[PDB]
Amino acid sequence: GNYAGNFSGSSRDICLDGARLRAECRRGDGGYSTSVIDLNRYLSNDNGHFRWVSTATVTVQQGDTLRDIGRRFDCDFHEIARRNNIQNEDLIYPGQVLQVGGNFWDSARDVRLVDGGKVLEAELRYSGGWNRSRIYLDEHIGNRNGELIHC
Numbered sequence: 210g211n212y213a214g215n216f217s218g219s220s221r222d223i224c225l226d227g228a229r230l231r232a233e234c235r236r237g238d239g240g241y242s243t244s245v246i247d248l249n250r251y252l253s254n255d256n257g258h259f260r261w262v263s264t265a266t267v268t269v270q271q272g273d274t275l276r277d278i279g280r281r282f283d284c285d286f287h288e289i290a291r292r293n294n295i296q297n298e299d300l301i302y303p304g305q306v307l308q309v310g311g312n313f314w315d316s317a318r319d320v321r322l323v324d325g326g327k328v329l330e331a332e333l334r335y336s337g338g339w340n341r342s343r344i345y346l347d348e349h350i351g352n353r354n355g356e357l358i359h360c
């Protein structure tokens with residue numbers, strides 16, 4: 210059951226510039242592109258752990274709670290309230306639009322690449338401390354004719 214991405218096998222000089230991934234990627238025509246993808250768009254900090262959640266919006270329905278929405282979308286409900294400036298996490302409303310996903314960077318430090326560029330490592334804030342977390346970029350990062358892409 211192969212990873213969907215697999216960028217690393219056709220790239221080199223893989224590096225970071227903030228939350229941005231940069232690589233020299235192999236093209237269809239045999240040449241190279243230098244390409245960048247913002248990992249802050251696709252990676253979230255789920256209370257101390259990298260999670261593949263793309264930046265997005267969800268609309269609250271009758272009967273939803275923040276725990277429910279956090280459950281449904283692999284997000285930490287305390288982050289959803291903080292990110293959406295919800296002072297009372299027990300009070301949300303049908304039709305409320307909430308920003309979810311991405312954003313790992315603003316709760317991360319010691320961000321770096323290990324294992325030849327295949328893995329992203331970082332200390333991620335959780336409620337109570339900092340947790341060293343690692344994620345296989347190849348899971349969802351692909352090279353598409355010289356362009357780093359999410360898939």
Ligand SMILES: CC(=O)N[C@@H]1[C@@H](O)[C@H](O[C@@H]2O[C@H](CO)[C@@H](O[C@@H]3O[C@H](CO)[C@@H](O)[C@H](O)[C@H]3NC(C)=O)[C@H](O)[C@H]2NC(C)=O)[C@@H](CO)O[C@H]1O
Pocket residue numbers: 269270271272273274275276277286298299300301302303
């Ligand atoms: C963090 C978390 O998820 N906590 C959960 C609580 O949210 C939840 O309490 C119930 O919350 C919902 C959602 O905010 C309440 O409904 C809102 O009520 C207002 C006022 O009546 C209404 O205007 C909104 O339309 C309505 N929102 C929605 C989305 O329908 C509801 O009244 C709360 N119910 C009670 C009994 O407190 C509790 C219970 O599910 O779980 C917590 O984990």
